[PDB]
Paper text:
The protein [name] (encoded by the [name] gene [C1_08500C_A]) plays a crucial role in the survival, pathogenicity, and antifungal drug susceptibilities of [name]. First, [name] has enolase activity and plays an essential role in glycolysis (catalyzing the conversion of 2-phospho-d-glycerate [2-PG] to phosphoenolpyruvate) in [name], as knocking out the [name] gene renders [name] inviable on media with glucose as the sole carbon source. Second, [name] has transglutaminase activity and an ability to bind host plasminogen (PLG) and thus plays a key role in the invasion and virulence of [name]. Enolase is a dimeric enzyme and is critical for glycolysis, where it catalyzes the conversion of 2-PG to phosphoenolpyruvate.
To investigate the mechanism of action, we solved the crystal structure of [name] [name](CaEno1) and then compared the difference between this structure and that of [name] from humans. The diffraction data show that in an asymmetric unit, four [name] proteins form two dimers. The interface formed by the two dimers is through four pairs of hydrogen bonds, as follows: K80 in the B chain and E285 and R314 in the D chain form two hydrogen bonds, D72 in the B chain and Q286 in the D chain form one hydrogen bond, and S425 in the B chain forms one hydrogen bond with K202 in the D chain. Two CaEno1 molecules form a homodimer face-to-face in an antiparallel manner. In this dimer structure, the β1 to β3 strand plus the α5 helix and α16 helix of each [name] form an interaction interface. The β1 to β3 strand is exposed to the protein surface, and the rest of the β strands are embedded in the interior of [name]. Interestingly the β4 to β13 strand forms a large β-barrel, while the α helices of the C-terminal domain are wrapped in the β-barrel to form a mixed α/β-barrel. This structure is similar to the three-dimensional structure of [name] in other species, suggesting that the active site of CaEno1 may also be in the C-terminal domain. We compared the sequence and structure of CaEno1 with S. cerevisiae [name] and hEno1. The consistency of amino acid sequences of CaEno1 versus S. cerevisiae [name] and CaEno1 versus hEno1 were 76.66% and 61.98%, respectively.
Numbering used by the authors:
A (entry chain B): 3 to 40, 44 to 440
B (entry chain A): 2 to 440
């Protein structure tokens, strides 16, 4: 099926090189771009030549595709519709467990481009191919709740605020079109309120499109967002999600909510139980629907205890905890540490393994939030992935840079194409695969 | 081949506001174009039609323009069965449907999407890349294709970024290398060095970006921004190989016949507002102090006397680019040519609204010995048309953002693909950017 496979480098949304693959069949040319990657994830290959792109070149990974993968896969004459055989072959070219000989970024571009070639071979949209090969439940397609970054903290902002991301989730409407419109309106009201309260510069955006004013406390951030939802006119219709990224402030088995302060008073660092009390207070006060990485990546007991406290009424999402890694995912399921997975395809390195991880999550009753990376591209693959996997949830940025909006625009085209055969996940996003 | 189906929808641009996207189907398949949108439009631009319904998208919906495509333009054009390779006949038909000089009946943002999609369908019908079709219909000189110098807006100010900085865009222009690929690599390395230097001098928040991907420090003088960029070039290792360009967008602070360099300060004192002559003297100092190769909109969009005076002083030393002055409009370019007000056109297809009129604007400029810089808007999309346009027109110059947000990199990535496709058949404009159409 594959008659020509060619890779090149292009630039990602932060100005760093990444791998793009042209995958040619008799049905035409199909292109994928790998987002930015990285002990638990598959390893992206960077060149390390400090004199070019500050060591971030990907000419070696590009060459691994053109010089090793392309002639091997072409010679194998594998039907691109058989995604599992394509990926099984890809993995046979690299014997390391983390794809470190060829590069996760070299392997993944080929995996994804073949999926695009296969959809066209069958005359179906990519999300329908993905629904087929992941064995999604038949019925109406489910369009995802966009979990939209609006406000950034932690490592991404000055001021004391320790939590890394605050997102809006427009769940209280009946269509994805309305959800995205309300999301854009709330985001614009938040930018306006941010500039007035924190100054004009505070309205300049970070890597994922959100703002990063100098905020002190979680309550201040959450109040700001609540103010934007109300001023935009959608009080009661917009949930809030947090990505705490608490590994960044885990110290001596406690949690330093002033970790950016070099004088941080250690007598105020919170135990596991005290941080759970704090989250439970915030849950009592705000329409928080999902919390990502509330406890540190290896603080397993803290996750399990917290999940028994709040797990039946809020989504708890592993990111640093699970790293789209089968062994870690199986651990978290068996421990009952969480009930939802961030799915980063370039953390695992092939589409088949990604679909496996998503299906193992669904089988445990977990949710799946298909996720962007900080270094994104104009590629829209994860939009079709979230629809095809029936995840009902996607995390792909603020509504404010086109490597973010390109995914959301693609779901707009999917929604229009499907018409009455699609359903917006709305408040049912946690269990959307079962709708 | 001719259109079999034409369908429009709204999508979201890089600022989160709706814009128009057109699906143009022929026997060769479906061709998609997306209309960009400026955050600060010149008063003479063709009309961008917005709905003004304040209960939806804060009045910035484009449902009317989308319905104008679906309900007026699409059935009429499909009926006419116009050969898509005949771009002028396509655009003449579109223009007849609207019948107004500024496209205010249907909206330039309903017309342009169809115009651009037609040209993509035309390239497919002929089995050639878009940039080659554009070279053909623009009657570009035959020979090597010319790849453009990427003018990268690495420090944002004015209406594109919160903070005190009056001038809208400070760009680097990596002219002192031999290939487009090297120019892009150097551009990214200078940008990353600039971001590091900016955060260490102005704080972490100053590394956040404006609309076009440039860093946005809260600085007050052009000298501060230019020193920062010079330091970034030097520390990256490319001293002497990178020119600087500015887009002043001076119409944004032209008030009472003077120029307010503190215009985002609501308490800006009118005593410090500069006259035309005072502003020209500041440019002359900056041109001497820094390797500035191009200045865009140095004076306001109808302040003809000041443009003429400034051109007399430095028109032989630097490129002087009309943007709001000319709005990619042949009638205003004629005035600028005859008055000797500038020597380059900023080509923004959506300021005039059809490809054919945009190409006429470029060819009128070339005929006067002017340069042409093909340009994005600050509200951009994943669309990559202007990459091929800059190559096809042989402009040697493109302005499509900093190497940061992907509505900017998408265009530069597309030029990387064109470069690789062309191989020895392409030349990098390099230091010859100003007269690249004659190379």
């Amino acid at each position: 099926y594959a008659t020509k496979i060619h890779a090149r480098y292009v630039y990602d949304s932060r100005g760093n090189p990444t791998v793009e693959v042209d995958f040619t069949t008799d049905k035409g040319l199909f292109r994928s771009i790998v987002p930015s990657g990285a002990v638990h994830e598959a390893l992206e290959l960077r060149d390390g030549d400090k004199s070019k792109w500050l060591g971030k070149g990907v000419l070696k990974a590009v060459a691994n595709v053109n010089d090793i993968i392309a002639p091997a896969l072409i010679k194998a004459k594998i039907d691109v519709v058989d995604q599992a055989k394509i990926d099984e072959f890809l993995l046979s070219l690299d014997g390391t467990p983390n794809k470190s000989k060829l590069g996760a970024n070299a392997i993944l571009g080929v995996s994804l481009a073949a999926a695009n070639a296969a959809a066209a071979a069958q005359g179906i949209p990519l999300y329908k191919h993905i629904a087929n090969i992941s064995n999604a439940k038949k019925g109406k397609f489910v369009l995802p709740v966009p979990f939209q970054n609006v406000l950034n903290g932690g490592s991404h902002a000055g001021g004391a605020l320790a939590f890394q991301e605050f997102m809006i989730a427009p769940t209280g409407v009946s269509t994805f079109s309305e959800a995205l419109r309300i999301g854009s309106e709330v985001y614009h009201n938040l930018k306006s309120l941010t500039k007035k309260k924190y100054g004009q510069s505070a309205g300049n955006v970070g890597d994922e499109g959100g703002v990063a004013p100098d905020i002190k406390t979680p309550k201040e951030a959450l109040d700001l967002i609540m103010d934007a939802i109300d001023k935009a006119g959608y009080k009661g219709k917009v949930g809030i999600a947090m990505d705490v990224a608490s590994s960044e402030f885990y110290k001596d088995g406690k949690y330093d909510l002033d970790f950016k302060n070099p004088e941080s008073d250690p007598s105020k660092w919170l135990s596991g139980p005290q941080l759970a009390d704090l989250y439970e207070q915030l849950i009592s006060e705000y329409p928080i629907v999902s919390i990502e990485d509330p406890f540190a990546e290896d603080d397993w007991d803290a996750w399990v205890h917290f999940f028994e406290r709040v797990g039946d009424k809020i989504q708890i999402v592993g990111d640093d905890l699970t790293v789209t890694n089968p062994t870690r995912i199986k651990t978290a399921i068996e421990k009952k540490a969480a009930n939802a997975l961030l799915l980063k395809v370039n953390q695992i390195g092939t589409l088949t393994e990604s679909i496996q991880a998503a299906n193992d999550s669904y089988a445990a009753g977990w949710g799946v939030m298909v996720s962007h990376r900080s270094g994104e591209t104009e590629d829209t693959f994860i939009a079709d992935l979230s629809v095809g996997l029936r995840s009902g949830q996607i995390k792909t940025g603020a509504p404010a840079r086109s490597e973010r909006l390109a995914k959301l625009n693609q779901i707009l085209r999917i929604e229009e194409e499907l018409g009455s055969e699609a359903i917006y996940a709305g408040k049912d996003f946690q269990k959307a695969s079962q709708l």
